[PDB]
Amino acid sequence: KAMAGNFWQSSHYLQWILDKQDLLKERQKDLKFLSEEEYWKLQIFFTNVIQALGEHLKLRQQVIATATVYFKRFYARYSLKSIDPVLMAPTCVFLASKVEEFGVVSNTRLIAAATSVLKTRFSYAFPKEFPYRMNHILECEFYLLELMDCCLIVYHPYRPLLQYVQDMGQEDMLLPLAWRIVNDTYRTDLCLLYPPFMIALACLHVACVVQQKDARQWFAELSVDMEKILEIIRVILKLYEQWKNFDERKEMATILSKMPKPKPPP
Amino acid sequence: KMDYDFKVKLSSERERVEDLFEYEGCKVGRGTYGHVYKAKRKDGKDDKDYALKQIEGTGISMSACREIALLRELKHPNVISLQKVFLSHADRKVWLLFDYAEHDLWHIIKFHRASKANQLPRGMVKSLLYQILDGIHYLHANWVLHRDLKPANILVMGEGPERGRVKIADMGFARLFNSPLKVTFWYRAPELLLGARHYTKAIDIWAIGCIFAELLTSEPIFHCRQSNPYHHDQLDRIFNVMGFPADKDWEDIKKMPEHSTLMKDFRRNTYTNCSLIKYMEKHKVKPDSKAFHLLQKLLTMDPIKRITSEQAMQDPYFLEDPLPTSDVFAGCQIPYPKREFLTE
Numbered sequence: 053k054a055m056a057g058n059f060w061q062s063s064h065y066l067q068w069i070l071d072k073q074d075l076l077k078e079r080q081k082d083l084k085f086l087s088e089e090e091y092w093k094l095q096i097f098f099t100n101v102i103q104a105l106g107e108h109l110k111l112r113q114q115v116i117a118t119a120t121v122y123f124k125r126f127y128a129r130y131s132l133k134s135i136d137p138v139l140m141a142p143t144c145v146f147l148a149s150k151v152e153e154f155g156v157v158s159n160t161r162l163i164a165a166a167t168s169v170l171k172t173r174f175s176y177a178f179p180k181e182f183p184y185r186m187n188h189i190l191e192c193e194f195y196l197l198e199l200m201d202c203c204l205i206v207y208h209p210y211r212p213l214l215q216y217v218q219d220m221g222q223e224d225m226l227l228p229l230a231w232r233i234v235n236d237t238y239r240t241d242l243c244l245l246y247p248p249f250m251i252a253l254a255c256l257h258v259a260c261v262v263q264q265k266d267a268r269q270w271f272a273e274l275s276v277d278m279e280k281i282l283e284i285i286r287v288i289l290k291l292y293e294q295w296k297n298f299d300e301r302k303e304m305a306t307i308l309s310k311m312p313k314p315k316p317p318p
Numbered sequence: 319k320m321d322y323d324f325k326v327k328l329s330s331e332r333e334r335v336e337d338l339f340e341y342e343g344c345k346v347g348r349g350t351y352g353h354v355y356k357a358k359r360k361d362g363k364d365d366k367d368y369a370l371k372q373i374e375g376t377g378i379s380m381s382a383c384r385e386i387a388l389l390r391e392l393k394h395p396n397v398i399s400l401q402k403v404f405l406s407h408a409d410r411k412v413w414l415l416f417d418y419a420e421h422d423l424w425h426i427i428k429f430h431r432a433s434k435a436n437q438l439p440r441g442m443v444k445s446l447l448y449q450i451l452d453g454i455h456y457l458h459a460n461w462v463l464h465r466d467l468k469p470a471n472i473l474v475m476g477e478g479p480e481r482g483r484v485k486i487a488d489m490g491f492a493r494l495f496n497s498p499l500k501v502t503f504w505y506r507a508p509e510l511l512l513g514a515r516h517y518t519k520a521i522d523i524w525a526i527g528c529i530f531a532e533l534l535t536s537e538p539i540f541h542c543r544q545s546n547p548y549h550h551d552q553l554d555r556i557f558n559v560m561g562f563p564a565d566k567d568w569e570d571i572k573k574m575p576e577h578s579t580l581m582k583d584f585r586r587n588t589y590t591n592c593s594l595i596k597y598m599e600k601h602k603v604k605p606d607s608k609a610f611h612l613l614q615k616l617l618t619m620d621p622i623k624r625i626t627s628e629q630a631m632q633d634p635y636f637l638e639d640p641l642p643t644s645d646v647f648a649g650c651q652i653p654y655p656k657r658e659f660l661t662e
């Protein structure tokens with residue numbers, strides 16, 4: 053609820069809506085090792101790790117989403133070789149959990165969650181157990197906060213989506229499907245490139261198309277750039293074709309070995 | 319597994335607090351929050367003073383995390399501004415840089431109260447009140463409660479570009495589950511003393527009413543002698559001042575968890591010759607003045623009948639001569655001393 057109406061003067065909007073061409077220029081560092089295709093498969097993979105960590109810890113979706121955005125912001129600026137993403141994922145959950153006020157994730161419960169999720173749900177990708185102890189989380193935490201320029205409040209599409217479906221008066225029919233599409237958009241770069249309400253709007257439109265709901269005049273009655281909303285729809289429709297043609301479980305061991313490795317100290 | 323080149327690059331470029339600021343011997347505060355210093359910039363780009371707070375403890379606690387999160391977003395003239403955050407990796411200490419505020423209401427009120435035996439600019443009180451209301455309104459519009467408003471936290475800028483502007487500070491950023499259930503109680507709303515489960519905008523507005531009455535009289539309105547939320551003697555003073563609340567004045571008081579304790583401990587008839595009219599009349603504030611009427615709306619016992627900050631700013635008290643000024647000192651010479659330094 054805190055800062056709900058301050059988006060247009062927020063640190064999210066003023067620093068962390070990136071230019072697409074700047075994003076891909078910094079990405080070229082890792083594209084010497086990975087293909088563009090392999091790079092998004094890695095992005096999809098680690099969005100699922102962070103999601104699994106969140107479910108295990110019983111965190112609400114918005115906390116999980118702030119965590120995912122911390123992870124995306126870090127690797128948008130820096131190489132995959134800089135900090136092991138296996139360390140960064142639980143660090144992002146840890147920090148995100150601490151920004152919200154209702155409850156705290158303890159040290160032993162964080163480490164036990166990382167250990168258990170990787171062994172039980174991700175043993176296709178990881179043969180060895182989670183090797184990092186809590187002091188590795190605490191050290192990584194300092195670098196993460198510092199790289200994000202202490203920007204912790206993150207706006208998500210869930211809140212505007214709820215307001216839009218309530219406005220249509222079709223909460224029962226459309227909200228479960230549309231909410232699930234917002235979840236899926238975190239598999240892409242969309243949260244680094246568009247304001248949350250536009251992502252919300254694109255997800256609602258796709259929900260209406262799938263369920264054959266005619267919301268043409270309701271969408272016309274909005275005052276917003278539709279061309280940009282169309283750009284998001286195309287990213288969402290392409291993500292489902294990516295999903296179809298991608299066997300995460302069969303491919304991700306090989307792709308994680310192609311990742312550039314952190315150089316040790318000589 | 320952390321890349322070495324990435325590591326030493328960041329270690330080379332990292333701004334360290336001890337290189338950037340002179341603060342040796344310039345400690346001006348020490349408490350549960352940590353240690354505050356009056357700092358000056360070593361690479362002399364400006365000659366401004368800054369407040370340097372080393373946060374209590376190590377790492378990033380929930381308190382630290384939320385203070386950084388919210389201050390990183392908040393921006394209003396009457397709320398204190400976080401200029402920068404230093405993370406010291408070796409000792410794991412967090413430093414926050416702020417604009418330096420020479421005075422506060424605790425030190426100002428204490429100076430007048432001290433000199434009264436052994437509010438000199440006209441319109442100072444009103445200006446302080448309006449700016450306190452303007453700041454708190456900005457927070458409340460962003461669903462940020464303060465949760466611990468008091469004269470020590472209402473800061474006032476000294477000589478410089480922001481001369482006499484109020485700066486709210488020390489927001490209660492971390493409270494578990496937004497709960498007061500998880501020592502002085504003079505600024506605490508009666509619902510908190512009756513076991514209210516959660517902080518509210520109204521609880522803050524009550525605090526503002528107490529401060530206001532303190533600015534007008536130089537005494538804390540609900541002053542009291544020194545775990546659980548119920549405090550008998552604190553409630554006794556509120557009743558001596560305000561009267562005991564009639565059933566019609568606060569219908570929902572029966573819903574409060576400590577209501578039956580109140581009934582057991584207190585009798586209405588004890589406070590029959592007690593009202594805010596009578597208290598303020600003894601301290602030479604007129605009960606027909608617009609200043610008194612606004613106060614009574616702020617110091618309303620039932621939380622649902624307390625005015626909001628946005629309605630308080632709109633009061634005709636602020637349209638009566640003298641008008642509120644941006645400089646609370648009204649361009650006049652500031653007769654208060656600077657902050658004394660401290661030891662370690």
Ligand SMILES: CN1c2ccc(-c3cncc(Cl)c3N3CCC4(CC3)CNC(=O)O4)cc2CS1(=O)=O
Pocket residue numbers: 346347351354369371398416417418419420422424470471473487488657
């Ligand atoms: C001696 N006192 C001093 C000293 C300095 C200052 C001061 C001067 N300028 C800017 C700032 Cl941000 C200052 N703060 C306010 C915020 C605070 C640190 C000190 C206090 N609680 C906290 O969590 O952070 C205030 C006060 C009131 S006091 O009576 O406690």
